Amino acid sequence: PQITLWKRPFVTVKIGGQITEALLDTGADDTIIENISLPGRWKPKIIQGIGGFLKVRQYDQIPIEIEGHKVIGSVVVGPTPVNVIGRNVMSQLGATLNF
Amino acid sequence: PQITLWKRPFVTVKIGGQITEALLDTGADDTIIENISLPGRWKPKIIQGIGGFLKVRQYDQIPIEIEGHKVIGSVVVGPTPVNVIGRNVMSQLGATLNF
Ligand SMILES: COc1ccc(S(=O)(=O)N(CC(C)C)C[C@@H](O)[C@H](Cc2ccccc2)NC(=O)O[C@H]2CO[C@H]3O[C@@H]4OCC[C@@H]4[C@H]32)cc1
Ligand SMILES: [Cl-]
Ligand SMILES: [Cl-]
């Protein structure tokens, strides 16, 4: 797609088989999802944001399906006001910002 | 431009006459800059992101120049780990995310 930015750029995604909605976020290095549960081992990440840091779970090697594209990536699970798809996923799509 | 996303999408911007560097951030509604000083009245604001909220100041009617484009927008001044250009500016450029 070609997505305009006069509203928040939400997309439906499937992450580890779980369908959720998330914001395409070029300011996020990582993909951060609150409302999913993933199985297995994870690595504590102190993740940083505008409000401070928090301790979360980094899960690796997760299947991610977005607008027909199928990629593998790391997914951070923890509290976030909105789920975000970061550049670790968008760069695998070849996504660009255009103006 | 067409900007890829395998590194952070920083651009040089002039805000209120001040040149700084900022991240093009589709997950930011607003433009948040730490290292500038703007004159005059402002509105207190609270914004929320990963890690919680933070209190900031909102200046209106600020001239913003980015890659040859000249727009007027509101600018939030306050602590942010990275300066971000949000959709309030990018939508005025007709920017799109493409993949
Ligand atoms: C209302 O208007 C707003 C309100 C909120 C924000 S924000 O900065 O909180 N944020 C909104 C988003 C959480 C829905 C914009 C994001 O693009 C921030 C922008 C941001 C960047 C860096 C630091 C703080 C904020 N990115 C961010 O929180 O990234 C996290 C996740 O991945 C990591 O990459 C980043 O780089 C390493 C740390 C962060 C981690 C901006 C304008
Ligand atoms: Cl990844
Ligand atoms: Cl504005």
PDB file of C-alpha atoms and ligand atoms in Angstrom:
ATOM      1  CA  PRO A   1       0.000   0.000   0.000  1.00  0.00           C
ATOM      2  CA  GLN A   2       0.588   3.744  -0.051  1.00  0.00           C
ATOM      3  CA  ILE A   3      -0.528   4.983   3.316  1.00  0.00           C
ATOM      4  CA  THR A   4      -1.245   8.657   4.035  1.00  0.00           C
ATOM      5  CA  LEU A   5      -0.558  10.207   7.429  1.00  0.00           C
ATOM      6  CA  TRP A   6      -3.476  12.546   8.098  1.00  0.00           C
ATOM      7  CA  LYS A   7      -4.731   9.843  10.499  1.00  0.00           C
ATOM      8  CA  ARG A   8      -2.794   7.260  12.530  1.00  0.00           C
ATOM      9  CA  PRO A   9      -1.436   4.511  10.188  1.00  0.00           C
ATOM     10  CA  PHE A  10      -2.957   1.414  11.807  1.00  0.00           C
ATOM     11  CA  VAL A  11      -2.771  -1.947  10.122  1.00  0.00           C
ATOM     12  CA  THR A  12      -4.026  -5.402  10.984  1.00  0.00           C
ATOM     13  CA  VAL A  13      -1.179  -7.832  11.635  1.00  0.00           C
ATOM     14  CA  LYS A  14      -0.779 -11.426  12.640  1.00  0.00           C
ATOM     15  CA  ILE A  15       1.977 -12.037  15.163  1.00  0.00           C
ATOM     16  CA  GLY A  16       2.722 -15.566  16.264  1.00  0.00           C
ATOM     17  CA  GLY A  17      -0.696 -16.491  14.866  1.00  0.00           C
ATOM     18  CA  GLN A  18      -2.504 -13.780  16.860  1.00  0.00           C
ATOM     19  CA  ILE A  19      -4.405 -11.095  14.928  1.00  0.00           C
ATOM     20  CA  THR A  20      -4.020  -7.595  16.444  1.00  0.00           C
ATOM     21  CA  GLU A  21      -3.923  -3.997  15.198  1.00  0.00           C
ATOM     22  CA  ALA A  22      -0.764  -1.908  15.361  1.00  0.00           C
ATOM     23  CA  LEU A  23       0.594   1.464  14.304  1.00  0.00           C
ATOM     24  CA  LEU A  24       3.247   1.618  11.544  1.00  0.00           C
ATOM     25  CA  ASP A  25       5.879   3.625  13.436  1.00  0.00           C
ATOM     26  CA  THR A  26       9.026   4.891  11.723  1.00  0.00           C
ATOM     27  CA  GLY A  27      10.260   6.300  15.057  1.00  0.00           C
ATOM     28  CA  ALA A  28      10.264   2.871  16.695  1.00  0.00           C
ATOM     29  CA  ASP A  29      13.363   0.699  16.231  1.00  0.00           C
ATOM     30  CA  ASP A  30      11.471  -2.294  17.640  1.00  0.00           C
ATOM     31  CA  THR A  31       7.976  -3.791  17.416  1.00  0.00           C
ATOM     32  CA  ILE A  32       6.154  -3.448  20.746  1.00  0.00           C
ATOM     33  CA  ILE A  33       2.835  -5.327  21.337  1.00  0.00           C
ATOM     34  CA  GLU A  34       0.817  -5.382  24.568  1.00  0.00           C
ATOM     35  CA  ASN A  35      -2.180  -7.613  23.839  1.00  0.00           C
ATOM     36  CA  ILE A  36      -0.559 -10.880  22.838  1.00  0.00           C
ATOM     37  CA  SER A  37       0.934 -13.838  24.706  1.00  0.00           C
ATOM     38  CA  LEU A  38       3.906 -15.646  23.067  1.00  0.00           C
ATOM     39  CA  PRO A  39       5.349 -19.037  24.244  1.00  0.00           C
ATOM     40  CA  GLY A  40       8.943 -19.758  25.299  1.00  0.00           C
ATOM     41  CA  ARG A  41      12.135 -18.080  26.530  1.00  0.00           C
ATOM     42  CA  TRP A  42      12.653 -14.345  26.198  1.00  0.00           C
ATOM     43  CA  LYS A  43      15.305 -11.732  27.046  1.00  0.00           C
ATOM     44  CA  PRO A  44      14.692  -8.884  29.467  1.00  0.00           C
ATOM     45  CA  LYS A  45      14.916  -5.691  27.568  1.00  0.00           C
ATOM     46  CA  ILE A  46      14.873  -2.543  29.290  1.00  0.00           C
ATOM     47  CA  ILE A  47      12.933  -0.778  26.667  1.00  0.00           C
ATOM     48  CA  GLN A  48      12.982   2.971  26.450  1.00  0.00           C
ATOM     49  CA  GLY A  49      10.259   5.446  25.465  1.00  0.00           C
ATOM     50  CA  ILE A  50       9.149   9.050  25.954  1.00  0.00           C
ATOM     51  CA  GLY A  51       7.924   8.372  29.524  1.00  0.00           C
ATOM     52  CA  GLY A  52      10.920   6.409  30.860  1.00  0.00           C
ATOM     53  CA  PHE A  53      12.000   2.786  30.634  1.00  0.00           C
ATOM     54  CA  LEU A  54      10.276  -0.483  31.494  1.00  0.00           C
ATOM     55  CA  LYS A  55      11.229  -4.130  31.872  1.00  0.00           C
ATOM     56  CA  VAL A  56       9.634  -6.269  29.124  1.00  0.00           C
ATOM     57  CA  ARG A  57      10.075  -9.595  27.227  1.00  0.00           C
ATOM     58  CA  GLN A  58      11.919  -9.763  23.885  1.00  0.00           C
ATOM     59  CA  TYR A  59      10.832 -12.773  21.879  1.00  0.00           C
ATOM     60  CA  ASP A  60      12.917 -13.788  18.859  1.00  0.00           C
ATOM     61  CA  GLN A  61      12.065 -15.597  15.627  1.00  0.00           C
ATOM     62  CA  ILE A  62       8.373 -14.713  15.559  1.00  0.00           C
ATOM     63  CA  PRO A  63       6.331 -15.071  12.343  1.00  0.00           C
ATOM     64  CA  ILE A  64       4.713 -11.754  11.383  1.00  0.00           C
ATOM     65  CA  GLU A  65       2.168 -11.355   8.595  1.00  0.00           C
ATOM     66  CA  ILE A  66       1.367  -7.819   7.400  1.00  0.00           C
ATOM     67  CA  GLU A  67      -0.600  -6.947   4.232  1.00  0.00           C
ATOM     68  CA  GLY A  68       0.310 -10.238   2.596  1.00  0.00           C
ATOM     69  CA  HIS A  69       4.011 -10.075   3.507  1.00  0.00           C
ATOM     70  CA  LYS A  70       5.448 -12.824   5.710  1.00  0.00           C
ATOM     71  CA  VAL A  71       8.573 -12.006   7.698  1.00  0.00           C
ATOM     72  CA  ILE A  72      10.328 -13.283  10.789  1.00  0.00           C
ATOM     73  CA  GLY A  73      11.267 -10.794  13.480  1.00  0.00           C
ATOM     74  CA  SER A  74      11.770 -10.071  17.117  1.00  0.00           C
ATOM     75  CA  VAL A  75       8.745  -8.854  19.056  1.00  0.00           C
ATOM     76  CA  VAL A  76       8.807  -7.001  22.367  1.00  0.00           C
ATOM     77  CA  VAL A  77       5.847  -7.785  24.610  1.00  0.00           C
ATOM     78  CA  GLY A  78       4.901  -5.326  27.327  1.00  0.00           C
ATOM     79  CA  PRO A  79       2.763  -2.355  28.175  1.00  0.00           C
ATOM     80  CA  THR A  80       2.481   0.269  25.471  1.00  0.00           C
ATOM     81  CA  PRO A  81      -0.377   2.751  24.961  1.00  0.00           C
ATOM     82  CA  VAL A  82      -0.652   1.536  21.391  1.00  0.00           C
ATOM     83  CA  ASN A  83       0.878  -1.419  19.662  1.00  0.00           C
ATOM     84  CA  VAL A  84       3.619  -0.359  17.218  1.00  0.00           C
ATOM     85  CA  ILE A  85       5.278  -2.026  14.245  1.00  0.00           C
ATOM     86  CA  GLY A  86       8.821  -0.708  14.172  1.00  0.00           C
ATOM     87  CA  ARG A  87      11.561  -0.493  11.622  1.00  0.00           C
ATOM     88  CA  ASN A  88      12.797  -4.038  12.433  1.00  0.00           C
ATOM     89  CA  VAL A  89       9.670  -5.174  10.531  1.00  0.00           C
ATOM     90  CA  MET A  90       9.199  -2.267   8.081  1.00  0.00           C
ATOM     91  CA  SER A  91      12.780  -2.467   6.751  1.00  0.00           C
ATOM     92  CA  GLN A  92      12.116  -6.142   5.846  1.00  0.00           C
ATOM     93  CA  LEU A  93       9.198  -4.920   3.715  1.00  0.00           C
ATOM     94  CA  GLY A  94      11.405  -2.422   1.870  1.00  0.00           C
ATOM     95  CA  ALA A  95       9.084   0.332   3.235  1.00  0.00           C
ATOM     96  CA  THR A  96       9.856   3.922   2.467  1.00  0.00           C
ATOM     97  CA  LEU A  97       8.748   7.370   3.577  1.00  0.00           C
ATOM     98  CA  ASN A  98       7.935   9.505   0.570  1.00  0.00           C
ATOM     99  CA  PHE A  99       7.241  13.240   0.211  1.00  0.00           C
TER     100      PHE A  99
ATOM    101  CA  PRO B   1      12.651  12.274  -0.971  1.00  0.00           C
ATOM    102  CA  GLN B   2      12.168   8.510  -0.771  1.00  0.00           C
ATOM    103  CA  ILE B   3      13.578   7.501   2.598  1.00  0.00           C
ATOM    104  CA  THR B   4      14.354   3.906   3.508  1.00  0.00           C
ATOM    105  CA  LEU B   5      14.003   2.600   7.038  1.00  0.00           C
ATOM    106  CA  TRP B   6      16.980   0.278   7.584  1.00  0.00           C
ATOM    107  CA  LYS B   7      18.445   3.153   9.687  1.00  0.00           C
ATOM    108  CA  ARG B   8      16.672   5.845  11.712  1.00  0.00           C
ATOM    109  CA  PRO B   9      15.115   8.451   9.328  1.00  0.00           C
ATOM    110  CA  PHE B  10      16.774  11.634  10.605  1.00  0.00           C
ATOM    111  CA  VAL B  11      16.426  14.869   8.717  1.00  0.00           C
ATOM    112  CA  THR B  12      17.736  18.369   9.249  1.00  0.00           C
ATOM    113  CA  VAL B  13      14.931  20.841   9.970  1.00  0.00           C
ATOM    114  CA  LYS B  14      14.672  24.514  10.779  1.00  0.00           C
ATOM    115  CA  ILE B  15      12.112  25.290  13.471  1.00  0.00           C
ATOM    116  CA  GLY B  16      11.450  28.877  14.417  1.00  0.00           C
ATOM    117  CA  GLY B  17      14.711  29.721  12.652  1.00  0.00           C
ATOM    118  CA  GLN B  18      16.711  27.134  14.651  1.00  0.00           C
ATOM    119  CA  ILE B  19      18.424  24.327  12.780  1.00  0.00           C
ATOM    120  CA  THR B  20      18.196  20.919  14.526  1.00  0.00           C
ATOM    121  CA  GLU B  21      18.055  17.250  13.613  1.00  0.00           C
ATOM    122  CA  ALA B  22      14.892  15.198  14.120  1.00  0.00           C
ATOM    123  CA  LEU B  23      13.446  11.758  13.397  1.00  0.00           C
ATOM    124  CA  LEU B  24      10.550  11.403  10.904  1.00  0.00           C
ATOM    125  CA  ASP B  25       8.101   9.576  13.150  1.00  0.00           C
ATOM    126  CA  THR B  26       4.836   8.199  11.827  1.00  0.00           C
ATOM    127  CA  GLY B  27       3.874   6.988  15.300  1.00  0.00           C
ATOM    128  CA  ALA B  28       4.015  10.548  16.719  1.00  0.00           C
ATOM    129  CA  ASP B  29       0.888  12.704  16.394  1.00  0.00           C
ATOM    130  CA  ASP B  30       2.881  15.777  17.415  1.00  0.00           C
ATOM    131  CA  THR B  31       6.361  17.246  16.795  1.00  0.00           C
ATOM    132  CA  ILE B  32       8.457  17.135  19.972  1.00  0.00           C
ATOM    133  CA  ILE B  33      11.827  19.009  20.140  1.00  0.00           C
ATOM    134  CA  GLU B  34      14.089  19.277  23.167  1.00  0.00           C
ATOM    135  CA  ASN B  35      17.003  21.456  22.050  1.00  0.00           C
ATOM    136  CA  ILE B  36      15.311  24.655  20.955  1.00  0.00           C
ATOM    137  CA  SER B  37      14.043  27.733  22.759  1.00  0.00           C
ATOM    138  CA  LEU B  38      10.887  29.413  21.246  1.00  0.00           C
ATOM    139  CA  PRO B  39       9.495  32.883  22.306  1.00  0.00           C
ATOM    140  CA  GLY B  40       6.080  33.752  23.735  1.00  0.00           C
ATOM    141  CA  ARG B  41       2.981  32.123  25.214  1.00  0.00           C
ATOM    142  CA  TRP B  42       2.394  28.348  25.220  1.00  0.00           C
ATOM    143  CA  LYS B  43      -0.124  25.746  26.393  1.00  0.00           C
ATOM    144  CA  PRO B  44       0.739  23.057  28.967  1.00  0.00           C
ATOM    145  CA  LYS B  45       0.236  19.587  27.505  1.00  0.00           C
ATOM    146  CA  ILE B  46       0.740  15.989  28.602  1.00  0.00           C
ATOM    147  CA  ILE B  47       1.701  13.326  26.099  1.00  0.00           C
ATOM    148  CA  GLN B  48       1.969   9.601  26.585  1.00  0.00           C
ATOM    149  CA  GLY B  49       4.211   6.986  25.106  1.00  0.00           C
ATOM    150  CA  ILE B  50       6.109   3.888  26.140  1.00  0.00           C
ATOM    151  CA  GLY B  51       7.136   4.187  29.751  1.00  0.00           C
ATOM    152  CA  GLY B  52       4.401   6.636  30.684  1.00  0.00           C
ATOM    153  CA  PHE B  53       3.479  10.280  30.242  1.00  0.00           C
ATOM    154  CA  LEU B  54       5.474  13.453  30.211  1.00  0.00           C
ATOM    155  CA  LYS B  55       4.579  17.024  30.689  1.00  0.00           C
ATOM    156  CA  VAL B  56       5.486  19.435  27.896  1.00  0.00           C
ATOM    157  CA  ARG B  57       4.847  22.904  26.425  1.00  0.00           C
ATOM    158  CA  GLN B  58       2.964  23.636  23.181  1.00  0.00           C
ATOM    159  CA  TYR B  59       3.866  26.504  20.905  1.00  0.00           C
ATOM    160  CA  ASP B  60       1.561  27.334  17.986  1.00  0.00           C
ATOM    161  CA  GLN B  61       2.090  28.947  14.598  1.00  0.00           C
ATOM    162  CA  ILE B  62       5.763  28.005  14.255  1.00  0.00           C
ATOM    163  CA  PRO B  63       7.528  28.154  10.851  1.00  0.00           C
ATOM    164  CA  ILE B  64       9.039  24.772   9.989  1.00  0.00           C
ATOM    165  CA  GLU B  65      11.308  24.171   6.987  1.00  0.00           C
ATOM    166  CA  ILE B  66      12.116  20.601   5.969  1.00  0.00           C
ATOM    167  CA  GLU B  67      13.705  19.479   2.720  1.00  0.00           C
ATOM    168  CA  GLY B  68      12.671  22.639   0.913  1.00  0.00           C
ATOM    169  CA  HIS B  69       9.065  22.557   2.197  1.00  0.00           C
ATOM    170  CA  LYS B  70       7.809  25.425   4.339  1.00  0.00           C
ATOM    171  CA  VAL B  71       4.894  24.782   6.643  1.00  0.00           C
ATOM    172  CA  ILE B  72       3.380  26.284   9.786  1.00  0.00           C
ATOM    173  CA  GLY B  73       2.698  23.948  12.689  1.00  0.00           C
ATOM    174  CA  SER B  74       2.527  23.508  16.420  1.00  0.00           C
ATOM    175  CA  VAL B  75       5.720  22.412  18.155  1.00  0.00           C
ATOM    176  CA  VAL B  76       5.961  20.765  21.571  1.00  0.00           C
ATOM    177  CA  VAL B  77       9.114  21.689  23.485  1.00  0.00           C
ATOM    178  CA  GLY B  78      10.281  19.417  26.275  1.00  0.00           C
ATOM    179  CA  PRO B  79      12.548  16.493  27.113  1.00  0.00           C
ATOM    180  CA  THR B  80      12.510  13.684  24.584  1.00  0.00           C
ATOM    181  CA  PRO B  81      15.342  11.212  23.993  1.00  0.00           C
ATOM    182  CA  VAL B  82      15.226  12.019  20.305  1.00  0.00           C
ATOM    183  CA  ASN B  83      13.625  15.008  18.548  1.00  0.00           C
ATOM    184  CA  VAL B  84      10.679  13.790  16.434  1.00  0.00           C
ATOM    185  CA  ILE B  85       8.766  15.254  13.533  1.00  0.00           C
ATOM    186  CA  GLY B  86       5.223  13.956  13.862  1.00  0.00           C
ATOM    187  CA  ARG B  87       2.253  13.578  11.578  1.00  0.00           C
ATOM    188  CA  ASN B  88       1.110  17.167  12.273  1.00  0.00           C
ATOM    189  CA  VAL B  89       4.039  18.155  10.005  1.00  0.00           C
ATOM    190  CA  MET B  90       4.292  15.094   7.754  1.00  0.00           C
ATOM    191  CA  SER B  91       0.646  15.208   6.697  1.00  0.00           C
ATOM    192  CA  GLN B  92       1.203  18.821   5.519  1.00  0.00           C
ATOM    193  CA  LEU B  93       3.915  17.458   3.204  1.00  0.00           C
ATOM    194  CA  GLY B  94       1.557  14.840   1.754  1.00  0.00           C
ATOM    195  CA  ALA B  95       3.999  12.190   3.075  1.00  0.00           C
ATOM    196  CA  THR B  96       3.155   8.541   2.614  1.00  0.00           C
ATOM    197  CA  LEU B  97       4.459   5.198   3.851  1.00  0.00           C
ATOM    198  CA  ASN B  98       4.953   2.854   0.926  1.00  0.00           C
ATOM    199  CA  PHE B  99       5.596  -0.907   0.715  1.00  0.00           C
TER     200      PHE B  99
HETATM  201  C1  LIG C   1       1.072  13.109  20.784  1.00  0.00           C
HETATM  202  O1  LIG C   1       2.277  13.184  20.060  1.00  0.00           O
HETATM  203  C2  LIG C   1       3.144  12.223  20.466  1.00  0.00           C
HETATM  204  C3  LIG C   1       2.857  11.365  21.522  1.00  0.00           C
HETATM  205  C4  LIG C   1       3.760  10.353  21.810  1.00  0.00           C
HETATM  206  C5  LIG C   1       4.957  10.305  21.090  1.00  0.00           C
HETATM  207  S1  LIG C   1       6.057   8.978  21.449  1.00  0.00           S
HETATM  208  O2  LIG C   1       7.412   9.498  21.197  1.00  0.00           O
HETATM  209  O3  LIG C   1       5.764   8.416  22.734  1.00  0.00           O
HETATM  210  N1  LIG C   1       5.806   7.755  20.337  1.00  0.00           N
HETATM  211  C6  LIG C   1       4.427   7.346  20.251  1.00  0.00           C
HETATM  212  C7  LIG C   1       4.279   5.815  20.221  1.00  0.00           C
HETATM  213  C8  LIG C   1       4.814   5.172  21.512  1.00  0.00           C
HETATM  214  C9  LIG C   1       2.823   5.445  19.997  1.00  0.00           C
HETATM  215  C10 LIG C   1       6.497   7.875  19.054  1.00  0.00           C
HETATM  216  C11 LIG C   1       7.501   6.755  18.854  1.00  0.00           C
HETATM  217  O4  LIG C   1       7.892   6.637  17.491  1.00  0.00           O
HETATM  218  C12 LIG C   1       8.704   6.756  19.809  1.00  0.00           C
HETATM  219  C13 LIG C   1       9.724   7.857  19.466  1.00  0.00           C
HETATM  220  C14 LIG C   1      10.850   7.771  20.509  1.00  0.00           C
HETATM  221  C15 LIG C   1      12.085   7.328  20.073  1.00  0.00           C
HETATM  222  C16 LIG C   1      13.113   7.133  20.986  1.00  0.00           C
HETATM  223  C17 LIG C   1      12.909   7.375  22.340  1.00  0.00           C
HETATM  224  C18 LIG C   1      11.684   7.887  22.754  1.00  0.00           C
HETATM  225  C19 LIG C   1      10.656   8.066  21.849  1.00  0.00           C
HETATM  226  N2  LIG C   1       9.391   5.467  19.752  1.00  0.00           N
HETATM  227  C20 LIG C   1       9.484   4.603  20.764  1.00  0.00           C
HETATM  228  O5  LIG C   1       8.862   4.722  21.844  1.00  0.00           O
HETATM  229  O6  LIG C   1      10.265   3.556  20.425  1.00  0.00           O
HETATM  230  C21 LIG C   1      10.462   2.513  21.392  1.00  0.00           C
HETATM  231  C22 LIG C   1      10.148   1.175  20.710  1.00  0.00           C
HETATM  232  O7  LIG C   1      11.288   0.815  19.934  1.00  0.00           O
HETATM  233  C23 LIG C   1      12.435   1.496  20.478  1.00  0.00           C
HETATM  234  O8  LIG C   1      12.882   2.407  19.469  1.00  0.00           O
HETATM  235  C24 LIG C   1      13.090   3.707  20.007  1.00  0.00           C
HETATM  236  O9  LIG C   1      14.465   4.064  19.924  1.00  0.00           O
HETATM  237  C25 LIG C   1      15.146   3.445  21.041  1.00  0.00           C
HETATM  238  C26 LIG C   1      14.121   3.620  22.172  1.00  0.00           C
HETATM  239  C27 LIG C   1      12.749   3.654  21.474  1.00  0.00           C
HETATM  240  C28 LIG C   1      11.977   2.353  21.645  1.00  0.00           C
HETATM  241  C29 LIG C   1       5.282  11.222  20.086  1.00  0.00           C
HETATM  242  C30 LIG C   1       4.372  12.236  19.805  1.00  0.00           C
HETATM  243 CL    CL C   2      13.892  -8.330  14.027  1.00  0.00          CL
HETATM  244 CL    CL C   3       0.150  21.560  13.648  1.00  0.00          CL
END
